[PDB]
From Swiss-Prot:
Included range, full protein: 182 to 376 of 548
GO biological process: chaperone cofactor-dependent protein refolding; protein folding; protein refolding; response to heat; response to radiation; virion assembly
Protein name per its UniProtKB record: Chaperonin GroEL
Post-translation changes: Phosphorylated reversibly during heat shock.
Organism: Escherichia coli (strain K12)
Gene Ontology CC annotation, any one: GroEL-GroES complex
Domain of life from the UniProt record: Bacteria
Protein function: Together with its co-chaperonin GroES, plays an essential role in assisting protein folding. The GroEL-GroES system forms a nano-cage that allows encapsulation of the non-native substrate proteins and provides a physical environment optimized to promote and accelerate protein folding, probably by preventing aggregation and by entropically destabilizing folding intermediates.
Annotated family: Belongs to the chaperonin (HSP60) family.
GO molecular function: ATP binding; ATP hydrolysis activity; ATP-dependent protein folding chaperone; identical protein binding; isomerase activity; magnesium ion binding; unfolded protein binding
Free-text comment about domains: Each subunit is composed of an apical domain that binds non-folded proteins and GroES, an intermediate domain and an equatorial domain that binds ATP and is involved in inter-ring interactions. Forms a large central channel that appears to traverse the entire length of the cylinder with no obstruction. The central channel of GroEL functions as two cavities, one in each ring, that are separated from each other by the crystallographically disordered 23-amino-acid C-terminal segments of the seven subunits. The entry and exit of polypeptide seem to be restricted to the apical end of each ring. Modulating the volume of the GroEL central cavity affects folding speed in accordance with confinement theory. Small proteins fold more rapidly as the size of the cage is gradually reduced to a point where restriction in space slows folding dramatically. For larger proteins, either expanding or reducing cage volume decelerate folding. A stepwise reduction in cage size results in a gradual loss of cell viability.
Quaternary structure, from the entry: Forms a cylinder of 14 subunits composed of two heptameric rings stacked back-to-back. Interacts with the co-chaperonin GroES. Can form asymmetrical complexes, composed of one GroEL and one GroES, and symmetrical complexes, formed between one GroEL and two GroES oligomers. The asymmetrical complex is the functional unit. It was suggested that the symmetric heterooligomer may represent a transient intermediate in the chaperonin protein folding cycle.
UniProt-annotated location(s): Cytoplasm
Primary subcellular site in the record, as a coarse category: cytoplasm
Chaperone keyword on record: yes
Length: 193
């Protein structure tokens, strides 16, 4: 069935990893304007991993959205202290889904935002991630339980090619569940443009 509106944004069901990211107290939300986006399937537990990116982000004077497997312990605490002091405007959320769908969805967001996934399996380090590796968007809105990426800045043909790929898989799918979950992804990418 038809969708009445257009680009509401790519949304996934993962909210803020700490209440201290909230910068819209009356709504209980996080709103980042023109944010850089860090994408990774790695679990961030240490702060040594995020320093290089945070310093770079801080030097550029731009907000940052961290999408990781999880951001915890000392790492989360250092993001909270730096965001509270106004050194960096950061927010961290978990990567959507699990298993293989999480990695595919991380790639969907990379392609939409023109970012590069810092993958565990490839041997990529957060430490060497640069500003070119980070995706970008007009706005990011994070609630208690959802994240919305509005207007990713990725290449249209690249975004188009990603959707063609998912359509290709849908044709080869053996289940309505598989086709439906694949259909989700297309709809998420469509909202992000």
């Amino acid at each position: 069935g038809l969708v009445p509106r257009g680009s509401e944004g790519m949304q996934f069901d993962r909210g803020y990893l700490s209440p201290y990211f909230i910068n819209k107290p009356e709504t209980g939300e996080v709103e980042l304007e023109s944010p850089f986006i860090l994408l990774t399937d790695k679990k961030i537990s240490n702060i040594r991993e995020l320093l290089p990116v945070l310093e770079a982000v801080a030097k550029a004077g731009k907000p940052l959205l961290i999408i990781a497997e999880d951001v915890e312990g000392e790492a989360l605490a250092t993001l909270v202290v730096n965001t509270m002091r106004g050194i960096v405007k950061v927010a961290a959320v978990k990567a959507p889904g699990f298993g293989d769908r999480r990695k595919a969805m991380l790639q969907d967001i990379a392609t939409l935002t023109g970012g590069t996934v810092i993958s565990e399996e490839l041997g990529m380090k957060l430490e060497k991630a640069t500003l070119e590796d980070l995706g970008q968007a007009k706005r990011v809105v994070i609630t208690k339980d959802t994240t919305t990426i509005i207007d990713g800045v990725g290449e249209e043909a690249a975004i188009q090619g990603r959707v063609a790929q998912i359509r290709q898989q849908i044709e080869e799918a053996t289940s309505d569940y598989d086709r439906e979950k694949l259909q989700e992804r297309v709809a998420k990418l469509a909202g992000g443009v």
